[PDB]
Design a protein around this ligand. Structure first.
Ligand SMILES: Nc1nc2c(ncn2[C@@H]2O[C@@H]3COP(=O)(O)O[C@H]4[C@@H](O)[C@H](n5cnc6c(=O)[nH]c(N)nc65)O[C@@H]4COP(=O)(O)O[C@H]3[C@H]2O)c(=O)[nH]1
Ligand SMILES: Nc1nc2c(ncn2[C@@H]2O[C@@H]3COP(=O)(O)O[C@H]4[C@@H](O)[C@H](n5cnc6c(=O)[nH]c(N)nc65)O[C@@H]4COP(=O)(O)O[C@H]3[C@H]2O)c(=O)[nH]1
Ligand SMILES: [Mg+2]
Ligand SMILES: [Mg+2]
Lengths: 153, 156
């Protein structure tokens, strides 16, 4: 399906781009809060080497399925590509971040998944590209400081 | 005709992933059997994204094209360059480690038109070591370079 990743059923790259545009438009038109997360796996390659790529595929599927487990009606999760994902949550930073962190903590428990993540909060007067740039930059700070963490913009 | 479409990356003209895997296999075999030296490099760009952001993807495409183009400018007749995918590349050099490494650093210095920043890792083929293992060593070395600040080459 267009806009959807065949393996995980999360949105695909073009799905992510459209979702970001629609979520930012919604925040600015409906007044809804919006937090964008950029996630990059830290240990999928070693999981693939140790248990095989099918095990790795399962890990990605689990990641997305479990996310759909707490994401709301207007929320979303998309696969940017490879082992990199984006998550859009229409809630306060407090709520969004607490749920995301608890979710990531749960995933560190069958092959444990380690994730580097960054977040950015939608604000009036910002466009989707700039929001993405902020969340993306935060993710790299998380990544290079060791991973297995969420750094806020 | 068939092979070229099956083993080469259309955009850059470097080998594609299938080509990288077959090139690594052949290079290790030649090293283990024919006895010549072989050094494998794993490279990952550090600053391509900002280039796309301000200049567009066509400009970024040109960066990848120039990278491979310049490589073919010094690579030997039996050496090779492949695109693992995205902005990640592998280079196979059938020469002694010193020669291979010196040639690579000289090339990366030249690239550092928009300047290119690259994280690189190398591994040398030795008896008892297969292609998958050689790749793992070079790959791990690249990651050490990347997390140490990038724009450098780390050896296994
Ligand atoms: N398997 C797979 N993974 C994907 C795909 N799209 C995105 N990713 C994953 O997401 C990361 C960042 O992608 P990006 O934001 O487009 O940021 C990219 C992009 O700006 C640039 N880049 C990569 N390939 C090309 C290309 O063919 N043309 C141009 N202009 N830029 C490229 O380099 C940046 C980093 O690339 P990576 O290190 O590979 O890191 C990539 C990759 O791990 C995909 O279609 N398939
Ligand atoms: N655009 C593009 N880029 C490519 C492609 N193939 C490789 N790359 C680039 O090369 C990096 C390492 O790829 P890998 O060795 O397969 O190592 C991969 C792989 O072991 C795993 N992975 C990614 N996607 C999948 C998947 O669908 N299934 C499984 N089992 N593992 C995956 O995560 C590792 C790192 O992925 P990345 O962070 O994305 O980082 C990727 C990506 O930046 C491609 O077809 N298209
Ligand atoms: Mg990744
Ligand atoms: Mg890369």
């Amino acid at each position: 399906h267009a806009l959807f990743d065949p393996l995980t059923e999360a949105l695909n790259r073009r799905g992510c781009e459209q979702a970001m545009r629609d979520s930012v438009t919604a925040a600015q038109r409906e007044g809804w809060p919006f937090v964008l997360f950029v996630l990059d796996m830290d240990n999928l390659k070693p999981i693939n080497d140790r248990f095989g790529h099918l095990a790795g595929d399962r890990v990605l599927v689990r990641l997305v399925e479990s996310a759909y487990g707490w994401l709301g009606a207007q929320d979303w999760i998309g696969r940017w590509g490879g082992d990199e994902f984006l998550i859009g949550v229409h809630a306060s930073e407090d709520e969004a971040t607490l749920k995301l962190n608890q979710w990531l903590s749960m995933l560190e428990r069958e092959a444990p998944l380690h994730v580097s993540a960054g977040s950015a909060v939608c604000e009036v007067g910002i466009d989707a590209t700039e929001l993405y740039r902020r969340a993306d930059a935060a993710m790299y700070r998380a990544k290079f400081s060791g991973g297995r963490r969420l750094v806020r913009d």
